[PDB]
Amino acid sequence: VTKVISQASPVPTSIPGVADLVGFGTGGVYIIRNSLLVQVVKVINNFGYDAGGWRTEKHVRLLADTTGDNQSDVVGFGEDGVWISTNNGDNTFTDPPSHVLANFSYLAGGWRVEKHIRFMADMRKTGRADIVGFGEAGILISRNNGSSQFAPTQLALNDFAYAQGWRLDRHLRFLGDITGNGLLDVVGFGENHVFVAKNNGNGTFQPAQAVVNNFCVGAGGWTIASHPRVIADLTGDSRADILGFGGAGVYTSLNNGNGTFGAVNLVLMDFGVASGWRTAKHVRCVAPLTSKKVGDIIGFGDAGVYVALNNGDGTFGPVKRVINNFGYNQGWRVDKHPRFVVDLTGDGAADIVGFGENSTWACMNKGDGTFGPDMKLISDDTSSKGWTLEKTVRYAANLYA
């Protein structure tokens, strides 16, 4: 499946891949390298609640390859600027980090978690991640010129920002390739339309185009509170399609190939409000779980994990409960226990990992969207050891492969 960057998952993982685990703890940054010999390693005495004053409410902490060597670096949008610790290649990182740009931050640029969105993305196919912010006047990009040299911001597009009415309480913004050229374009679920903007390849976009009169708060009644939406390749043409978890169930609009979109269809009467699904208590994802390399549906519900497998064309097979765990009825809580659907084995079929009450747990995908037994990986990065949502950040991320 293709690289999609979203508000919900700003650190994309690779398909295929062997994702590592990263924790921005109170004392700093810790990693669990995906390997046969499992352990927790502290790598930076920074980017933490008690290690530099990092706060979920004011700052953004991410992983992205900022150098082009295919290793992920630690990036923090802090109080006064953007701070980077680079991956040394051997499960260590530079410490202290370096401040590379006095912008995209609370006091330098006036950026706010409540109003603005900050991502890291290779926007020009350089192999390096540029800074991309949806701010006040539009989308601002700082070009990564290599060797920690970040160009001052340029207004990539005068849209998808606070001045054009975009709000985190009402709308969704994504980066994803909707044309097939390998460049990340902008997809925005606005007030009355899904808009797209095509990437020019040089740090700017074409003007936005309304492509679907649906999936929005003012078109079809789609709320952030009840109806999560994603973009993902549902068909295998490498272009992002639209999928929504609506009232009745799952709605899709398939990309025509060029970033225009087809009809809106209800393709599955499950995973919606009508079948009991709730943003407050459940996790719904789209990720490849089989050899077809298209988006399948995963849902951490009450009784456990439910999957519907894509037939290969954006329609789905029956819903099956594949694991009687990671669900609400086994004590998993959206506000305490992060759960991710990511490739941990390198075969292209996404696995399940969860940071539980006492242990990190995983289940291996057998390659066909069925799973093995719940495996206990390690008793760290968990609630019981002080890792809370309010004070810490945890990701699955490809640090190397």
Q: Does 340 bind ligand NAG (CB under 6 A)?
A: no
Report, in Å, the least distance between residue 355 CB and Na ion: 18
Position among 17, 301, 314, 348 found at the interface with ligand NAG (CB under 6 A): 301
Q: Does 28 bind ligand NAG (CB under 6 A)?
A: no
Strands of 209-212's sheet, edge to edge?
5-6, 172-176, 185-189, 194-197, 209-212
Task: Answer yes or no: are the C-beta atoms of 156 and 166 closer than 8 Å.
Answer: no
Interface residues with Na ion (CB under 5 A) are 59, 65, 67, 69, 71, 73, 77, 87, 89, 105-106, 177, 179, 181, 183, 185, 233, 235, 237, 239, 241, 343, 345, 347, 349, 351, 365
The backbone torsions φ and ψ at residue 372, rounded to the nearest 5 degrees and listed phi first, read -85, -170
Q: Which residues of 338-348 are buried (b: 16+ CB within 10 A; e: fewer)?
A: bbbbbbbbebb
Position among 24, 30, 49, 54 found at the interface with ligand NAG (CB under 6 A): 54
Report, in Å, the least distance between residue 345 CB and Na ion: 4
Residue matched to tokens 């940071």: 355
Binding segment toward ligand NAG, per CB under 6 A, in 5-13, 109-117, 307-315, 340-348: 109-117
What lies within 8 Å, CB to CB, of 167 at 6+ separation is 115
What lies within 8 Å, CB to CB, of 216 at 6+ separation is 171, 189, 190, 191, 192, 193, 194, 222
Report, in Å, the least distance between residue 1 CB and ligand NAG: 23
Q: Does 330 bind ligand NAG (CB under 6 A)?
A: yes
- Footprint of ligand NAG (CB under 6 A): 46, 52-54, 59, 78-80, 83, 96, 103, 109-111, 116, 135-137, 140, 153, 159, 164-166, 171, 190-191, 195, 208, 214, 220-222, 227, 246-248, 251, 264, 270, 275-277, 282, 301-303, 306, 319, 325, 330-332, 337, 356-358
